[PDB]
Specification:
monomer, 402 residues, alpha/beta, D-Maltodextrin-Binding Protein, domain 2, 2 domains, eight-stranded mixed β-sheet, 17 helices, 12 strands, globular, binds a molecule of 2 linked components (BMA-BMA), metal ion binding, metal-binding, SBP, signal, zinc
Length: 402
Amino acid sequence: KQVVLTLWYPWAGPDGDAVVSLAKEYSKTHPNVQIKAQMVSGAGIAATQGGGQGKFLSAVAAGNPPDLVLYWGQDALPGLADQGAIIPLDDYLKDVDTSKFFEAAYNAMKYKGKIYGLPEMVNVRVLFWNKDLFKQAGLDPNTPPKTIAELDQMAAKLTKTKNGTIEQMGFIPWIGQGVPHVMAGVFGTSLVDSNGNPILSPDKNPQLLNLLKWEVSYSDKYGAMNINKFIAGMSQNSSQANDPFVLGKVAMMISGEWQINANKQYNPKLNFGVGPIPQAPGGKPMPSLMDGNTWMIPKGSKHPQEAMDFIKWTMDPQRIADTADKVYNIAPIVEAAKIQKLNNDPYFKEVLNVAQKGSIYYTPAAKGMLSTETAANNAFQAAQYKKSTPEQALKNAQAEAE
Ligand SMILES: OC[C@H]1O[C@@H](O[C@H]2[C@H](O)[C@H](O)[C@H](O)O[C@@H]2CO)[C@@H](O)[C@@H](O)[C@@H]1O
């Protein structure tokens, strides 16, 4: 076709299918535009444990990057913008009524006086629990823990061992969305300061150490190697048919609202609750990170106007409401969110209450966020694996982040 537009999206499965379907329908109905949709994990943008690198930044350097990317968060935009790896959208957007977007979602697109993306979906973090497993412990299946202390107590009651072998875990702090850049906010702290500089060491961020020591209390109590053997093969930090909650192997898990989708599709018999994350010592009641997916146009995009035209088409209120319902996300346009069919879904109503009544926090906007995340991620893993003390792991992380 006249315009061949390459799109990168960041996950396979149902979410991937939804994006592929959007691209396919647009292409079918537009004789002069074809969209080649390609799944590259984390859009090649997400922080990885590898040697820095990154498939997106590599593609930008190589000179033929995708014309459009869909990334799964709001944490990467400042760094990509500062590097000049994505183009400003201000002229494309000047005559677009951006008041239609949720304020917080659109505000995250702003960096150094320019606009560098558009919100594709809005996400929040919640607690999932297995009601059948609660009943087996003599816990009220309709009442989740309100504090981390309560969570820890319930978790012990919900852990099963047979002849020394773990058969069921009550809770594993670091799986699902229990990642450092989420849990920091739950504990009322951050990975960076007001200037965007890393605050990872115990002497720079005592509360971060508190969080890590709490996580490691699980490693010490249940056994680090035991936990790792128990969850071997399972999807540790993404919603899948084989994530530990869907498999019924962990009784409670912190995840995104989207997790409802995986639960329903892959384990229809799974009897689960959805509710607020329990309050941490030093954190606010019912904490939740509000973020979302982000469209960006890479530096090197051959077809920025056509990319923008496709985005606009995906943003049709009914269309995006339908997309949001399909993937169990919150539509990023206020009008669309209000008409979503999931407004009448029992699980999603709990999600909307979190969005409306929870103590909402946001990822800080920092150009070095992703490298700071990598340093924090490595430290948390090292401590969980007992390769370092939590204290030394975080000291090491500070040096790496700097
Ligand atoms: O799993 C589909 C949802 O993915 C979300 O992004 C996740 C990503 O899958 C992974 O788990 C990573 O560790 O965290 C991301 C959130 O920060 C969102 O893209 C959501 O919209 C999808 O429905």
